[PDB]
Amino acid sequence: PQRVAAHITGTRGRSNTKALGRKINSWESSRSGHSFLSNLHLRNGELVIHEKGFYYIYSQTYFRFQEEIKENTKNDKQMVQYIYKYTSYPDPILLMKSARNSCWSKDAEYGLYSIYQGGIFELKENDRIFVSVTNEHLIDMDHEASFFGAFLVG
Amino acid sequence: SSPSEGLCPPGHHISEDGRDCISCKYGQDYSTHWNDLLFCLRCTRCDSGEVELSPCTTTRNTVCQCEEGTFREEDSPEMCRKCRTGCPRGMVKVGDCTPWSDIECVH
């Protein structure tokens, strides 16, 4: 209960049965998608840091799509997820990045590309951290499919 | 209403103090079997290339089915896959293309 952790998710429900990319800011709160915040707060999709320390930050971001051949389209897709942090400095700082390309075969009908990445970084008080993607319109936000988290690792 | 065995019924869901039943928002979340959930389960909205076959109520989740001409197999439940049109040579077709199966060609 006196613990520093957080795992916020894609709103939009659940399945069947100077900074590159664009920031994801449609993440939201209280255990229903099964999110939570705990000694951290939110600020337009940026987690804000109370306790200065080492934090294992992570996010998965799912890319789902179908595709066609068109008159003026190159089909190559660069799916990159960025995890930046805003510090006391004017311009954001990229912390981690993970990328993938789509298949090339003109025979592709669809694309399923989920991207997990994470790692510990030392953050200070009031450091703000956010996820950021390319091909945003391709990101599926079913709530298990894409999320964003961090914890303190004392 | 009030609890019944420490359970709230479908459509409803329990409170923090554990004492009262609260009711899932309509076409937003749900609960179908008797529960002790502090939160209603969120509603599905048909991913693309599907059809909504029934709306998400309060005691039933929305139902999605593959588009017409696409199927959904057990091990590929993530994209609806296009039904084949032809069979190969020396092979003859018995069993049309359904929402859950490809076409079925024999010899």
């Epitope: 391709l138 | 309509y26 998400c56 588009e67």
Partner: antibody
Framework: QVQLQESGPGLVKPSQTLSLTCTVS??????????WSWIRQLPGKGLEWIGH???????YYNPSLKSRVTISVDTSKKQFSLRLSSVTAADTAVYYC??????????????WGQGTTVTVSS | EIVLTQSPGTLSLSPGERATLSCRAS???????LAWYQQKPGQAPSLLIY???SRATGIPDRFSGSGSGTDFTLTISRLEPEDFAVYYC?????????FGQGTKVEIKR
């Protein structure tokens, strides 16, 4: 058959709260079906979906309208009401109320009111 | 937000000639979640096509809907002079429910 009446002030004052109400004739809101809904249309261009409400009193709003918006029902009173907040120039527009068949099999608005044109000034 | 993009802005066509209206969504969306509206000057809109390709009650067969994924098409076959309003698509895909800028069919006399 089923008809809708845009009742409500055609004027509201800069950063005061706009309000309107919709009336229902022939058949009643109650009936666990449709979503009673507010659409505005912004000086001769795009329609904007504001938010809708169900007969169980549960709402749905357009995020970007960073809750200024509230909307409600009274089946005993046969009307649903919208209220913006804090309004300005960018809130001046015709405001339709309408009945969307949530999935009671369509998805889409089969019934509209004629919609009142609201102007925000003092 | 999912963005619909109606092409083109306007169309001029004499009666009898054939009208193809495009509506293309920034992300692919069901199909159950695409509907078409017609809005005659000084009227509230009214529902033409629902479910990408279903005629609302009362709508003349002259009107048709097609498409899926991101590309959706509304087709008016043999134009009457009435049919010269403005036409909107909207998507109940996800959410805000959104509308396209709209395509305006103008008569040719």
């Amino acid at each position: 058959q089923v008809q809708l009446q845009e009742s409500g002030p055609g004027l509201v004052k800069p950063s005061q709260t706009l309000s309107l109400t919709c009336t229902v004739s022939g058949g009643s809101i109650s009936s666990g079906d449709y979503f009673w809904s507010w659409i505005r249309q912004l000086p001769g261009k795009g329609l904007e979906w504001i938010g809708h409400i169900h007969n169980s009193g549960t709402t749905y709003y357009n995020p970007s309208l960073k809750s200024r918006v509230t909307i409600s029902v009274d089946t005993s009173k046969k009307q649903f009401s919208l209220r913006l907040s804090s309004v300005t120039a960018a809130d001046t527009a015709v405001y339709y109320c309408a009945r969307d068949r949530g999935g009671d099999y369509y998805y889409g608005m089969d019934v509209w009111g004629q919609g009142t044109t609201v102007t925000v000034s003092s | 937000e999912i963005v619909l993009t109606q092409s083109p802005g306007t169309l001029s066509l004499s009666p009898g000639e054939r009208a193809t209206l495009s509506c293309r969504a920034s992300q692919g969306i069901s199909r159950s979640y695409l509907a078409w509206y017609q809005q005659k000057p000084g009227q509230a809109p009214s529902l033409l096509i629902y479910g990408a390709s279903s005629r609302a009650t009362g709508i003349p067969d002259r009107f048709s809907g097609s498409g899926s994924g991101t590309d959706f098409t509304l087709t008016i076959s043999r134009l009457e002079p009435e049919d010269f309003a403005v036409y909107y698509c909207q998507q109940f895909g996800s959410s805000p429910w959104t509308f396209g800028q709209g395509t305006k069919v103008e008569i040719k006399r």
